[PDB]
Design a protein around this ligand. Structure first.
Ligand SMILES: CC[C@H](C)CCCCCCCCCCCCC(=O)O
Length: 283
């Protein structure tokens, strides 16, 4: 038994971790209104993406990995001698990437695929990859890893804000906000993005993100927090610095950013605060 762990590009793992653990990536893509298509990778300079998105009369659209891209990746890992593949996917609530990876796993011969619906995105999704790789090294079997990740998902969540709900509304990735067709605070709930509160200022929304999350993770035996920032540098920097001041060092507090595919749906000003009830290995 040789177990591989792979994921899609929206887990936004650093190239260092991808290189070190040889993590295969099924990439998602972005398509701009001038017909220019782009595949997600760390090669992309993210400020260049925000610039083109701001200079687009029409919001760009995104694509999940086609089912054939999952298949090709599964066959490559099988043909390298892997018998089992753990697949960490973007939330099934916002993308078909998981169901495609699931269906692709049924269709590929000679290797066992264990697709996992992270029910989130970005480096919070990435944390499931890093937990899976850690357990593989420790000798666990695929069902034990899927069981552990499922328990991890019960103590994992995220809150977030955006400058303008237009991008989420255009793509249909905000649920239950038909009345809004003030500053909204959103959260993930069973893999979908819903409104949580509405505050008067952006600064109060950022303080609200911290309070919501700290109130939750206070009861966890292990805590990892991720500040995941968009195109406004000082917003993520302000939240990250304040968390380092307000949290004990027993909390793991990390920083990351949104890639093009997620940025296309949030628009400018996206800022997330995510939590995992585990001490995830980030090295
Ligand atoms: C701290 C964690 C953060 C709060 C996470 C925020 C994630 C926001 C996701 C926006 C929606 C992306 C849909 C991509 C669909 C891709 C497709 O299938 O086309």
């Amino acid at each position: 038994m040789k177990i591989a762990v792979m994921t899609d590009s929206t887990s936004y793992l650093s190239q260092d971790l991808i290189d070190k653990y040889n993590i295969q990536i099924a990439p998602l893509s972005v398509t701009f209104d001038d017909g220019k298509n782009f595949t997600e990778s760390n090669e992309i300079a993210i400020e260049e993406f925000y610039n083109k998105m701001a200079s687009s009369q029409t919001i760009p659209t995104t694509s999940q990995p086609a089912i054939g891209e999952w298949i090709t990746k599964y066959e490559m890992l099988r043909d390298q001698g892997y018998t089992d593949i753990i697949v960490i996917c973007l939330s099934s609530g916002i993308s078909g990437s998981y169901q495609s990876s699931y269906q692709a796993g049924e269709m590929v011969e000679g290797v066992n695929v264990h697709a996992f619906d992270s029910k989130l995105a970005a480096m919070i999704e990435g944390c499931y990859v890093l937990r899976a790789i850690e357990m593989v090294e420790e000798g666990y079997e695929p069902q034990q890893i899927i069981d552990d990740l499922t328990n991890m998902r019960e103590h994992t969540g995220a809150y977030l804000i955006v400058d303008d709900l237009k991008n989420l509304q255009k793509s249909g990735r905000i649920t239950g906000a038909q009345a809004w067709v003030m500053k909204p605070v959103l959260k993930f709930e069973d893999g979908k993005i819903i409104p949580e509160e509405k505050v008067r200022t952006k600064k109060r929304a950022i303080q609200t993100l911290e309070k919501k999350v700290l109130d939750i993770v206070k009861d966890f035996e292990e805590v990892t927090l991720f500040v995941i920032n968009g195109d406004h540098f000082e917003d993520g920097q302000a939240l990250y610095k304040k968390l380092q001041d307000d949290c004990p060092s027993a909390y793991q507090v990390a920083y990351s950013e949104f890639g093009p595919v997620v940025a296309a749906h949030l628009g400018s000003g996206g800022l997330g605060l995510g939590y995992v009830g585990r001490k995830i290995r980030l090295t």
